[PDB]
Every structure is written in C-alpha cells, then in structure tokens.
Design an enzyme around this catalytic site. Sequence first.
Site, mmCIF file in Angstrom:
data_model
loop_
_atom_site.group_PDB
_atom_site.id
_atom_site.type_symbol
_atom_site.label_atom_id
_atom_site.label_comp_id
_atom_site.label_asym_id
_atom_site.label_seq_id
_atom_site.Cartn_x
_atom_site.Cartn_y
_atom_site.Cartn_z
ATOM 1 N N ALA A 68 0.749 -1.186 -0.038
ATOM 2 C CA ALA A 68 0.068 -0.026 0.129
ATOM 3 C C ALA A 68 1.041 1.247 0.022
ATOM 4 C CB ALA A 68 -0.899 -0.175 1.151
ATOM 5 N N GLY A 95 20.487 -2.260 -10.497
ATOM 6 C CA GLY A 95 21.150 -1.481 -9.401
ATOM 7 C C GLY A 95 22.547 -2.514 -8.983
ATOM 8 N N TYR A 97 23.572 -3.086 -5.952
ATOM 9 C CA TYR A 97 23.457 -3.978 -4.766
ATOM 10 C C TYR A 97 22.631 -5.226 -5.088
ATOM 11 C CZ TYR A 97 21.664 -5.922 -0.211
ATOM 12 O OH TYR A 97 21.311 -6.539 0.775
ATOM 13 N N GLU A 143 24.080 -4.824 -13.813
ATOM 14 C CA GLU A 143 25.236 -4.336 -13.470
ATOM 15 C C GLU A 143 26.559 -5.496 -13.321
ATOM 16 O OE1 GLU A 143 26.137 -0.889 -11.129
ATOM 17 O OE2 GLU A 143 24.163 -0.026 -11.947
ATOM 18 N N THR A 212 28.542 7.260 -17.072
ATOM 19 C CA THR A 212 29.811 8.187 -17.424
ATOM 20 C C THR A 212 30.166 8.762 -16.389
ATOM 21 O OG1 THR A 212 28.158 9.315 -18.815
ATOM 22 C CG2 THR A 212 29.925 7.878 -19.880
ATOM 23 N N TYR A 213 30.067 8.003 -15.054
ATOM 24 C CA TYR A 213 30.636 8.330 -13.898
ATOM 25 C C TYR A 213 31.069 7.237 -13.063
ATOM 26 C CZ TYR A 213 25.743 7.189 -13.128
ATOM 27 O OH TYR A 213 24.412 6.709 -13.375
ATOM 28 N N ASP A 214 31.619 7.407 -11.915
ATOM 29 C CA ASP A 214 32.255 6.447 -11.062
ATOM 30 C C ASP A 214 33.467 5.850 -11.857
ATOM 31 O OD1 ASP A 214 30.194 6.423 -9.179
ATOM 32 O OD2 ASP A 214 29.089 4.789 -9.820
HETATM 33 C C1 LIG Z 1 21.828 3.940 -12.204
HETATM 34 N N1 LIG Z 1 22.838 2.624 -11.796
HETATM 35 C C2 LIG Z 1 23.758 3.499 -11.242
HETATM 36 O O1 LIG Z 1 24.225 4.659 -11.258
HETATM 37 N N2 LIG Z 1 24.840 2.500 -10.770
HETATM 38 C C3 LIG Z 1 26.021 2.664 -10.395
HETATM 39 N N3 LIG Z 1 26.474 3.761 -10.369
HETATM 40 N N4 LIG Z 1 26.675 1.438 -9.956
HETATM 41 C C4 LIG Z 1 28.108 1.382 -9.310
HETATM 42 C C5 LIG Z 1 27.927 2.126 -7.846
HETATM 43 C C6 LIG Z 1 27.465 1.250 -6.680
HETATM 44 C C7 LIG Z 1 27.796 2.028 -5.491
HETATM 45 N N5 LIG Z 1 28.846 1.789 -4.886
HETATM 46 C C8 LIG Z 1 29.671 2.630 -4.073
HETATM 47 O O2 LIG Z 1 29.581 3.849 -4.226
HETATM 48 C C9 LIG Z 1 30.908 2.105 -3.478
HETATM 49 N N6 LIG Z 1 31.321 2.830 -2.209
HETATM 50 N N7 LIG Z 1 32.075 3.264 -2.094
HETATM 51 N N8 LIG Z 1 33.177 3.988 -1.886
HETATM 52 C C10 LIG Z 1 26.500 1.696 -4.500
HETATM 53 O O3 LIG Z 1 26.152 0.564 -4.651
HETATM 54 N N9 LIG Z 1 25.823 2.550 -3.813
HETATM 55 C C11 LIG Z 1 26.381 4.084 -3.408
HETATM 56 C C12 LIG Z 1 26.464 4.862 -4.803
HETATM 57 C C13 LIG Z 1 25.382 4.231 -5.698
HETATM 58 C C14 LIG Z 1 25.228 4.981 -6.717
HETATM 59 C C15 LIG Z 1 26.035 6.087 -7.216
HETATM 60 C C16 LIG Z 1 27.183 6.482 -6.357
HETATM 61 C C17 LIG Z 1 26.994 5.791 -5.151
HETATM 62 C C18 LIG Z 1 25.054 2.336 -2.825
HETATM 63 C C19 LIG Z 1 23.577 2.373 -3.333
HETATM 64 C C20 LIG Z 1 22.613 3.282 -2.503
HETATM 65 C C21 LIG Z 1 21.428 3.591 -2.958
HETATM 66 C C22 LIG Z 1 21.112 2.896 -4.239
HETATM 67 C C23 LIG Z 1 21.552 2.086 -4.941
HETATM 68 C C24 LIG Z 1 23.027 1.754 -4.323
HETATM 69 C C1 LIG Z 2 33.926 1.811 -2.978
HETATM 70 C C2 LIG Z 2 32.725 1.218 -2.714
HETATM 71 C C3 LIG Z 2 32.731 -0.132 -3.046
HETATM 72 O O1 LIG Z 2 31.734 0.042 -4.133
HETATM 73 N N1 LIG Z 2 32.515 -0.431 -5.121
HETATM 74 C C4 LIG Z 2 31.929 -0.577 -6.470
HETATM 75 C C5 LIG Z 2 32.932 -0.590 -7.327
HETATM 76 C C6 LIG Z 2 33.753 -1.844 -7.227
HETATM 77 C C7 LIG Z 2 34.646 -2.058 -7.990
HETATM 78 N N2 LIG Z 2 34.613 -1.519 -9.272
HETATM 79 C C8 LIG Z 2 33.695 -0.558 -9.311
HETATM 80 C C9 LIG Z 2 33.720 -0.013 -10.744
HETATM 81 C C10 LIG Z 2 32.859 0.971 -10.979
HETATM 82 C C11 LIG Z 2 31.925 1.254 -10.003
HETATM 83 C C12 LIG Z 2 31.865 0.546 -8.896
HETATM 84 C C13 LIG Z 2 32.771 -0.288 -8.549
#
Ligand SMILES: CNC(=O)NC(=N)NCCC[C@H](NC(=O)C[N-][N+]#N)C(=O)N(Cc1ccccc1)Cc1ccccc1
Ligand SMILES: C=CCO/N=C/c1ccnc2ccccc12
Length: 497
Positions: A68, A95, A97, A143, A212-214
């Site tokens: 709900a 995503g 996770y 991913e 195109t980030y991370d």
């Molecule tokens: C639209 N999908 C995406 O943007 N995906 C993506 N950016 N995937 C890789 C990033 C995963 C991210 N991990 C980290 O930041 C590692 N931590 N450190 N250092 C992650 O799983 N989360 C943080 C995050 C997510 C997206 C962008 C930046 C950071 C946790 C998370 C929190 C909420 C929802 C999903 C994941």
């Molecule tokens: C730094 C926190 C852990 O989350 N990491 C995600 C991750 C790990 C290894 N390689 C990557 C490459 C691109 C985006 C995320 C990751």
Amino acid sequence: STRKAVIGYYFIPTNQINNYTETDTSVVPFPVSNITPAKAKQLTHINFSFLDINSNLECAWDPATNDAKARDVVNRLTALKAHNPSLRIMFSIGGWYYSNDLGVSHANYVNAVKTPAARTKFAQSCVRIMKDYGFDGVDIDWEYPQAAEVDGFIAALQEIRTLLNQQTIADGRQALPYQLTIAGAGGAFFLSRYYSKLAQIVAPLDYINLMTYDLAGPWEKITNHQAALFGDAAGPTFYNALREANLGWSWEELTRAFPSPFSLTVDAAVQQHLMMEGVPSAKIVMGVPFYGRAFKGVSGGNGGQYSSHSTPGEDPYPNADYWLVGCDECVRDKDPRIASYRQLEQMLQGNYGYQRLWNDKTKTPYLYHAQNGLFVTYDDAESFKYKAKYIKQQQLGGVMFWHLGQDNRNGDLLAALDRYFNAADYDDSQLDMGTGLRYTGVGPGNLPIMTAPAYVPGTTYAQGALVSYQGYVWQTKWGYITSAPGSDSAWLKVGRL
Ligand SMILES: CNC(=O)NC(=N)NCCC[C@H](NC(=O)C[N-][N+]#N)C(=O)N(Cc1ccccc1)Cc1ccccc1
Ligand SMILES: C=CCO/N=C/c1ccnc2ccccc12
C-alpha cells in the site's frame, strides 16, 4: 529540434517506503513533494528505483515492501504528469546492490534471461508490474551481464519491447508510447562484456543511458576525476579492454578503434558507442553524477589530483571515522566516501577548509582540503555547460543523472541542464571546449566523410595511398597494391563519400 531527454533517478529504499512521510527528513530525506512543478517540467523521465528480479524469476518489489505504501509513493510520482504531458515515470530493475556479480539477487538475473520460457515469464512480469503500478516504461540496470549471458539479455530486451509495443497499442498511447531503456556501462572494462553485440542491445531501446561516472573511486590506486569530459595527460591511463572483445576485426581495424592505454573519460565512452555500426547517436544518453567521490590520505602538489590515497574500498564502510569534514549527510549515511552536490555546496560555504579547484582539460571541478589531505571529484553547473555542449554537438539523445535527492534544495543542477538545452537566451556558441585529450578511435559506425581520387585498375599504390571506390575512401595498409579496394585484405576502409 527534438527535445533532449533529461532522465533523473528517484531512489527510495524499502525502509523509507515503509515509513513514507513528507514531513520528516530524518525519516525520508527526499519525499516526492520535493519534486516541485518547476522541477517536473524540467525532467522528461523520472526513473523510480529499484525493483528486483526474485527467485521466481519475475520482476518484483523487495518482498519486505509494504505494498500500500509503495503504491502511494508511485501515485505521487505519476501525479506529477499533470504538470508535464511529456513526463514519464519509468521504473528501474537492478542496481549495483541487487545485480552485481556478487550481489544478493545476481543468479535471478542470469536465470531470468537464460531460456525462451524464462524470458517470456520475465518479460510478462515487467509489463504487468508496469501496468499494475502505473509506470510509463521499463529501465534495466543489470551491472552487468557477462559476455556468455549477453544473447539471453538481448532476447529478453527484444521480448519486453514487443510486449511494451502491444501495451502502447492497447492503451492508445501513441502520444507517449511505453519505453524501454538500460543503464549501460560507461567505462571500457565493464562495457567489454557486451560491446561486440552493442547494436543488438541498443536496437530494442529508446535510450541507452551511459553511466559515465564512477570512473574513479577507492578501488583505483590513484585519485582521479570520476567523470572527466576529456583526458588530462597528467592523469592515469588504462588498458583498452575493447581491443580484446570478440569483434572479428583485423589488427589495423582494432588498433585504429582502440588506442591503448587511453584516458577513461565521458568522451571515450560516448565515442566507443558511436564507433559501432547500428548504434545511433540519438539513443545515446550521457549519465552525469549529482554526487562527488571523496578520498583521504592524499598528497599535495596538484590539488590532490593523481595522488596515492588511503580511502577504504570495503563495503560497508569499515569504521565510524567519518573524515569528510563538514559532510553531515555522510554521518547520516555512515560513509564519508560519497557526498551529494547538495552537501558539497554547504562544505564549500562553511569554515571546513576546502578549496574549489578546476581542471581545464577535463572540464570538471574538484575540492582539495590541503590540511587533512582530502580530494573530492564531482560535477556542477559549470562542468554541465561543457557536457551539455558535447551532447548537442555529438547529437546525443540527452542526459541522465543519479540522483534527484542529491541536487541542492532549489534544484540548481537540474535547472542548469534544462537551461543549457532549452533556454532561448542561453548561448554556448563561444564556449571553449579546451584542449583536453579526445578519444580518437574510429570504427565502422563513425567513419568520417572524405574524398580521394578514384581507384584506377593497374595502378601500383604505395603504403598509405588513399582512393575512392564504391562509396568509400580506402587506404593501402602496405605497398604495392593493385587489387580493387574491399576485394582483399590490403585496403582499409577509412572514410565514406
Ligand atoms: C543507475 N545505476 C547506477 O548509477 N549504478 C551505479 N552507479 N553503480 C555502481 C555504483 C555502486 C555504489 N557503490 C559505491 O559507491 C561504493 N562505495 N564506495 N566507495 C552503490 O552501490 N551505492 C552507492 C552509490 C550508488 C550510486 C552512485 C553513487 C554511489 C549504494 C547504493 C545506494 C542506493 C541505491 C543504490 C546503491
Ligand atoms: C567503494 C565502495 C565499493 O563500491 N564499489 C563498487 C565498485 C567496485 C569495483 N569497481 C567498481 C567500478 C565501477 C563502479 C563501482 C565499482
């Protein structure tokens, strides 16, 4: 002419859905009511995130979700369409996770796409969920499928597309047809998993939204910009994994397309997509981050850029030292490694010891804390000017960003993107794109227009000679060649007439 897409993720975790409230930011920091009518008008898509694939191999809400309360949240989002008849509320499945190689639901993604019967059951569940909750389309953020799973992933997208098209006809929705997108890899290492079949992946989609980030983070040895538009020769470079993809191309073809090492930039990912035949520029959407990535233990000298660092890479963050000075949201989220633009503005404005610096090659800002040795890579309204200009020049489909709650309170990042695409009085004709490193790869999908003398039978061509023949310009790979271009391996197709 065609309006650029502006696609913003709306992420809300299960606990926040189950306790949803619009009047308590300590419970829900970013309720739907923060997406005001002005913001709604500036978006073309909101990606509601995240749903998952369950062990029954269907698209599904996290089972702990209160149904709900979920419908109530989604209803508030779809209510926004009253302010913008172009707006779509998509939902996203996956995503990091849920769907990463070691993620909690990973096997369900692999299995859902694995056979015709599974793909049918999965595709049906996606459209069923879409209709049941009132969403306008489906975004898949796995991913990432591995090279072996790619054919099943492709077939799943094709089948979803057919079911969406049926639904559009059934609902007379031709004015706003149901859509299909994916969040695609924005860097060559993950992109290499499905790169060879990129045309088949993109065919059923309205857009591929490049992440195109991370492109930098604590998993890398050296600090760097996470979303550099163009390359800085002073920064790190990477092996080009695409040259090892199963393309069937020749040494010269591979070399011309995939310089190695190369600069890991937004321009690199975009050009890598454009190099492939059958991948139209208008379906490519450039992702941008509404957050920065923070590193500690950095040395001085270049404002903390390209430094070794002592930032933990473990998940979850391994202790309670929240060392990103001034980052209150980091304390809330128990992680000093990521800071929203909203928070970064406050960190600059307060007495916290940061300088905002600018790299004029990458066209991106960064913070440096000289006293403690911290470095933050992020994007702002200024880096967005260059990225918007690139989107227009390259005729890309638009921009995507993660995530809406990370824009500042007034929505200044979203407003800037909208202005750069749509404001009659904004002029970037003189905006200087700089001399940062361009990705120079050429492939079958992005041959430049050229002219050359017509090929003449009987003539002995030296290495490097250029001729025109049957619609293209060709270059001899060695000398002395007398074959007709395209008839054997001596000629490289280098341009189109
Ligand atoms: C639209 N999908 C995406 O943007 N995906 C993506 N950016 N995937 C890789 C990033 C995963 C991210 N991990 C980290 O930041 C590692 N931590 N450190 N250092 C992650 O799983 N989360 C943080 C995050 C997510 C997206 C962008 C930046 C950071 C946790 C998370 C929190 C909420 C929802 C999903 C994941
Ligand atoms: C730094 C926190 C852990 O989350 N990491 C995600 C991750 C790990 C290894 N390689 C990557 C490459 C691109 C985006 C995320 C990751």
